[PDB]
Design a protein around this ligand. Sequence first.
Ligand code: CL
Ligand code: CL
Ligand code: CL
Ligand code: CL
Ligand code: CL
Ligand code: CL
Ligand code: CL
Ligand code: CL
Ligand code: CL
Ligand code: CL
Ligand code: CL
Ligand code: CL
Ligand code: CL
Ligand code: CL
Ligand code: CL
Ligand code: CL
Ligand code: CL
Ligand code: CL
Ligand code: CL
Ligand code: CL
Lengths: 170, 171, 167, 171, 167, 170
Amino acid sequence: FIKKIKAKANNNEINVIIEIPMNSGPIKYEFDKESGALFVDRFMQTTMSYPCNYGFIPDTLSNDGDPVDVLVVAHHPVVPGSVIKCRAIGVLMMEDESGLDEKIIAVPTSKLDITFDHIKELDDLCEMLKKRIVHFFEHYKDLEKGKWVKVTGWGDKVKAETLIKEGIDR
Amino acid sequence: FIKKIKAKANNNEINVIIEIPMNSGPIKYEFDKESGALFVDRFMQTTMSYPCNYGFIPDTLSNDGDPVDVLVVAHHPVVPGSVIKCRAIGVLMMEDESGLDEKIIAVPTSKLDITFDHIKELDDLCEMLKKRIVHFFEHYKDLEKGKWVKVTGWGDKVKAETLIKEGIDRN
Amino acid sequence: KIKAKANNNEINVIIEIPMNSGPIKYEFDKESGALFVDRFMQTTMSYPCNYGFIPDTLSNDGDPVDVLVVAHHPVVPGSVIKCRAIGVLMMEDESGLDEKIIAVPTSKLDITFDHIKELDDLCEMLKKRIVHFFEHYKDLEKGKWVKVTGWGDKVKAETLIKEGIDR
Amino acid sequence: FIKKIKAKANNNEINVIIEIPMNSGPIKYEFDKESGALFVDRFMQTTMSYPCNYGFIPDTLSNDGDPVDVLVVAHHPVVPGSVIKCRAIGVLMMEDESGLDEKIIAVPTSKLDITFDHIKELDDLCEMLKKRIVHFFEHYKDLEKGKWVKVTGWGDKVKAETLIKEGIDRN
Amino acid sequence: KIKAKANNNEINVIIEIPMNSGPIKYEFDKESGALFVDRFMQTTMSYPCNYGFIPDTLSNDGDPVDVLVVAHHPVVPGSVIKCRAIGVLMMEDESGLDEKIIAVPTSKLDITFDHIKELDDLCEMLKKRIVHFFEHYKDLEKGKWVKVTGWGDKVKAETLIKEGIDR
Amino acid sequence: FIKKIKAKANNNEINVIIEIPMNSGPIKYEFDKESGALFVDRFMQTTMSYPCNYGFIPDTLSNDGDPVDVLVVAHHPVVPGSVIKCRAIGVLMMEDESGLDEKIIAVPTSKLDITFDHIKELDDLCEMLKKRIVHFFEHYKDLEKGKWVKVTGWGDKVKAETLIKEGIDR
Ligand SMILES: [Cl-]
Ligand SMILES: [Cl-]
Ligand SMILES: [Cl-]
Ligand SMILES: [Cl-]
Ligand SMILES: [Cl-]
Ligand SMILES: [Cl-]
Ligand SMILES: [Cl-]
Ligand SMILES: [Cl-]
Ligand SMILES: [Cl-]
Ligand SMILES: [Cl-]
Ligand SMILES: [Cl-]
Ligand SMILES: [Cl-]
Ligand SMILES: [Cl-]
Ligand SMILES: [Cl-]
Ligand SMILES: [Cl-]
Ligand SMILES: [Cl-]
Ligand SMILES: [Cl-]
Ligand SMILES: [Cl-]
Ligand SMILES: [Cl-]
Ligand SMILES: [Cl-]
């Protein structure tokens, strides 16, 4: 199914296949590219869990050979393997032990969740929500030897849009 | 997998691909027929959640080209995308903003849940469950602009079987 | 599509029934790749382990080699755990004889299982719960029963897996 | 609060203080009568959970001095320590390591859940629920050293009402 | 034993029914202090907010002043949320007037609610869901109904609370 | 009920009233000893939740005026307000913004959970559990202005028992 979902349904939206639902315990899942199966990547050893629904845009390629990764801000978790129709609003800038690490910040389209309609940019998101996202990524690998993540900042909507465009065209 | 499952395993059962589990919060899921992926359709704005497991019968086309939809009465939710083996016992009749809408009422086979063995028709279901199904569909689109639902009535098992048969034939 | 083994020290296990997940028994259908509800269990019992099978395997029952993955947390149905076999559980039932592989996540998935090399490393009460589950879970199912006969060691598990892969 | 609740609100009702919710994992709770605190009794070692909401009737004393205990057949779990208004429909008769053991079977009053209104006797409950209640109690102490339970049979409504009345009179 | 107010800008709210917690309605019994099951609700609906009451208060119904606490998470029945009122929901039931205070946790419990000072600060879909719930949660209960007639401001709420304490 | 439960049932046992169940989301509860009610202390803003069942020994008085606090290592969460019968095996030593901060480390007695019979000292707990507990306390207040926690080390069973005895006798 992953090879036949489009990256974008229209000009304004992106399709994001969820791998890890918000607040759903210690399991990190990842889709295997060459089989389409959902693999357990890790039983996490902290008490932490994802601050948003996490997944990727199908039919995309980042610089690292992986699809473009997305954090979908939502009011509720969604099952792994399900697709949320979203719009990009910004990007989370990070660095891990192997270099640059960017995630798109997206919200569901208004036909899925009208309460996000007024959310157009990162500045419209709750400060504590953003602090919590930062805290999660800066700390979720603290007990994992060899691996770390540092947040460097945020990028705007235009940056999110160009990165997704670059991932579709690459 | 949707394009690989028969509508009926035998004369007396239907396969029902589940989209929305019973009593499982505000998420409304739907299979996209082109990709075969399960899409989030809506984060529902009411406090309501589905009174039965909800899905469709593969390899059927209803009147309007959509697969035949099913309410699987059960005691427990199942995973979205899992398939329940069922038998039809009736149909729920409604009207929505785009016209006539009908949903089959079904129960698992006795091989799956023996406790449903003696439920042969709608009248075998308790009154309050039927009332809750009606009240759900009448009200779950109350906060959704442009979209409404009104329940017309019920039809028996023979009406369900004819509806399923015409779905398989149309497919 | 998915290998039975990623390397010599590992098995891939597709989960059908998560540990401690209520009454639903699931089973993957080969031809469709769909997850079918097998039954709604009539007892108050749940699986004591994540339960599934090794892809690309075939045992004498005509089914793939099935596996009880000992774990600290449930995993969603249809997800794949990277594992290693440590033992086998031996059973008899109404259909003949039955064997389930006892596996644990690789140390890449869950470092806390690194010290678990054999069945003797599993805690006693876990093994008793496992035995108790299989001996009683079909109690309210007419015409079906299970009886646990014993355990098999690591090499026995590897042999059963090798044989499953060849067949 | 245990000390401030009547056994019976009216002639056809019992107040039931819940210790263990149905289907709520491996925790077995019990009210300490001296402190009024809810203690953890056991982290159960089987995979089993309670088939009904389980508790006792305040201001009753069974033949062995314990309060009269009750299985409350309901469609949903209730928080530990909460009180459900019920009517008795029967008794489950058992034998344990200490000796004779009896649990009243009750359902919520119609004011709390109208769907229980037509359940008057034990034969009105479905066969598989009764078999599951029996199966639970016969096996839940299987992994517990020195403790066992054996079901000896069921008693009707009149039997439950007598047992409750003797319970109040003994208190 | 619990005060109605910790200070001038705060009310203590004992929770009876947590938000999004299924069909059970609970009510505290004053004499025993026990949490009674009031109803197994027959709809698929659940409470849109944490629902409880201000201890040491008396309304016209003979009950304490009740309160819908806007929160991001459920809290256990019997626990106490430190709150502040921002408004009132005005309703009419089969027995007369039905008023309920709209409260938010204090900034010491949840800083994200600091900017919510009046009902206009609450998002409108939430307010629509609140109204929807109260207008339909008694639909399957014979002889009982509710009509929402409007909202009242913070001053209206503080007056209602002060009277409840005085009474 | 709080003022009716004993601190210790026998020589080998402590009674611990649970305020916060392990892995049970953002809600941080605390008993008000003046009223006996369970208050919400905080809606936590991180993705973290308690790694143990957390509560106190009733009828105890610490140096700081509060009951002796306990982290009960257990295999499952327990409802708030319920009492677990435990034995102390050690102490978590910490400092917060207002000074010394010790928590007892306990396990259920063998009559409640036999799988803890062999755990007699902190060395018997697995390393990752202890790393997770340390990590929780060092970070759970990161998003809370003016409050912090530093872990200084661990004390043995004797230190635990002395602290408990001091709390009962104070
Ligand atoms: Cl980790
Ligand atoms: Cl949009
Ligand atoms: Cl975090
Ligand atoms: Cl875009
Ligand atoms: Cl909606
Ligand atoms: Cl059948
Ligand atoms: Cl409804
Ligand atoms: Cl069964
Ligand atoms: Cl390994
Ligand atoms: Cl078991
Ligand atoms: Cl046990
Ligand atoms: Cl009644
Ligand atoms: Cl059972
Ligand atoms: Cl109702
Ligand atoms: Cl405030
Ligand atoms: Cl609603
Ligand atoms: Cl916080
Ligand atoms: Cl002990
Ligand atoms: Cl942590
Ligand atoms: Cl001690």
